[PDB]
Amino acid sequence: VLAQNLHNLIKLSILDISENYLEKDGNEALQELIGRLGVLGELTTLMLPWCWDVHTSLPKLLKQLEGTPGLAKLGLKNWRLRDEEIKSLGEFLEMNPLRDLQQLDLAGHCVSSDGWLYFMNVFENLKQLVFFDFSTEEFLPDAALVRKLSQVLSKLTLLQEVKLTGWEFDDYDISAIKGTFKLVTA
């Protein structure tokens, strides 16, 4: 229904359905979106529909990510994503000349600290990122990631605070080098 009148809703910088489960075929919402990108470019930010197994909808999403530039924030929020996928999206992101975004909101995906480890290989060059939170619904106990984070942390610039929403782990003696910015356990 939102889709049918959306060219009139072009006036919106914000149409927000995020953090929502649609009843059936929620991830299939995205195909409707590919049709609507001519006016979805007019939104100032990315709000994705999510559902169970939503992440399988990511290739569908990729036509949509050429639309990453009028994006205030970027996420695959509440996308229950493959642990590998975060570096994968990162690869598109390597191929993506866009820069400076303010916050990367990934509401808890299924990605592990090990997954994130793959991702550090992409996170360093997105040092232009202002804010970030990395959530997961059942995080691995290892702080080896924070260490790899430290490798990335020299590499990062415009970041004001690190956000740890949902990570049940201890940071160990690595918390000595936890960040060169502020930190919240959430």
Binding site: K148, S150, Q151, D173, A176
Partner: protein, 350 residues
């Protein structure tokens, strides 16, 4: 007049002279002046003597008269000895850096001054002054090749890692020697893990570690890359062979205390996985000749290898003939082949 001051540096040979009045002299030159100690740094580049080798030995740092992981990297008992004071230079250097408070100004020089050199620390004798250099220039730490650490008594090293929190990834090769451990706190293995993530390559010699059994697993899970493994005077089963095989990145591999013939499914036929092994040294190994033939099957993948030594092999019989067969089966890039103190035939030479 400055060159006259400089000619007073035609008087002095390297750090060497730490034993006498001019050792400290460059320090006194530097506390005295700023920018001018760049001239001092110039003579530090005019050092070709490597200090002095007298009274010093590459076998004093570990405190051993027996093969190390560093020893697996080489064909002799010594070699660092020749250029033993390569890190002796560094202690002088941190003091010198500190003395004119030389900040980032003298850095091109110090990246070049400690280059081609390695530093080795014992845990028992850990100086406090190493985080000192890291004042203005912790990054130039990567002028050096390997910072080497020996950890005895207990796995407990929070003090060691604190150093690698201050430095940028990644060190090329990082090496660790394990002595007299009877407390392998699988918890403190991890601190070694923090040390290990600093390097692209990690080399380990586990020596007299009676607390080390299948627990090498903990040692490996934390390893980015087990670049070289040597095991002596410690608990050893045949299964630990697999950890050796998990790492395809392996350049150098020795184990000199098996004393038992290697099985049918032994490590000898996982050479097909270690393609990067450029050096293999097997000393005083008990083996099966047929197993040696299986070892032979491995050498086709060992074309990237620069060195093969099989010595003091007993029960090898004509297996060595077979290994030689594998040698002459196909070309190799090998630069070194040692067939000493194994059972050799005139036929094998043929």
């Amino acid at each position: 007049e400055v060159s006259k001051g400089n000619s007073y540096l035609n008087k002095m040979v390297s750090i060497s002279d730490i034993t006498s009045l001019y050792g400290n002299l460059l320090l006194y030159t530097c506390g005295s002046s700023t920018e001018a100690t760049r001239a001092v740094m110039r003579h530090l580049a005019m050092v070709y003597q490597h200090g002095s080798l007298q009274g010093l030995s590459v076998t004093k740092r570990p405190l051993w008269r027996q093969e190390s992981i560093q020893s697996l990297r080489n064909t002799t008992e010594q070699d660092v000895l020749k250029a033993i004071n390569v890190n002796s230079f560094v202690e002088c250097g941190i003091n010198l850096f500190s003395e004119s408070m030389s900040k980032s100004d003298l850095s091109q020089e110090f990246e070049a001054f400690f280059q081609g050199k390695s530093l080795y620390i014992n845990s028992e004798n850990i100086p406090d002054y190493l985080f000192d250099f890291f004042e203005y220039l912790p990054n130039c730490a990567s002028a050096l090749d390997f910072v080497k650490l020996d950890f005895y008594e207990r796995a407990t090293p929070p003090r060691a890692v604190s150093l690698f929190f201050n430095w940028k990834q990644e060190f090329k090769t990082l090496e660790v020697t394990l002595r007299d451990i009877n407390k392998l706190n699988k918890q403190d293995i991890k601190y070694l893990g923090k040390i290990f993530s600093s390097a692209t390559n990690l080399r380990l010699h586990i020596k007299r570690c009676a607390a080390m059994a299948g627990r090498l697993s903990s040692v490996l899970r934390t390893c980015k890359n087990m670049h070289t493994l040597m095991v002596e005077a410690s608990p050893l089963t045949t299964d630990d062979e697999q950890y050796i095989t998990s790492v395809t990145g392996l350049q150098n591999l020795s184990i000199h205390r098996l004393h038992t013939q290697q099985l049918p499914g032994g490590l000898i036929d996982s050479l097909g996985n270690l393609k990067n092994l450029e050096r293999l040294i097997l000393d005083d190994i008990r083996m099966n000749e047929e197993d040696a033939k299986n070892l032979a099957e491995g050498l086709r993948s060992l074309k990237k290898m620069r060195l093969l030594h099989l010595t003091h092999l007993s029960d090898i019989g004509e297996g060595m003939d077979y290994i030689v067969k594998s040698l002459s089966e196909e070309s190799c890039d090998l630069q070194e082949m040692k067939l000493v103190a194994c059972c050799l035939t005139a036929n094998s030479v043929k």
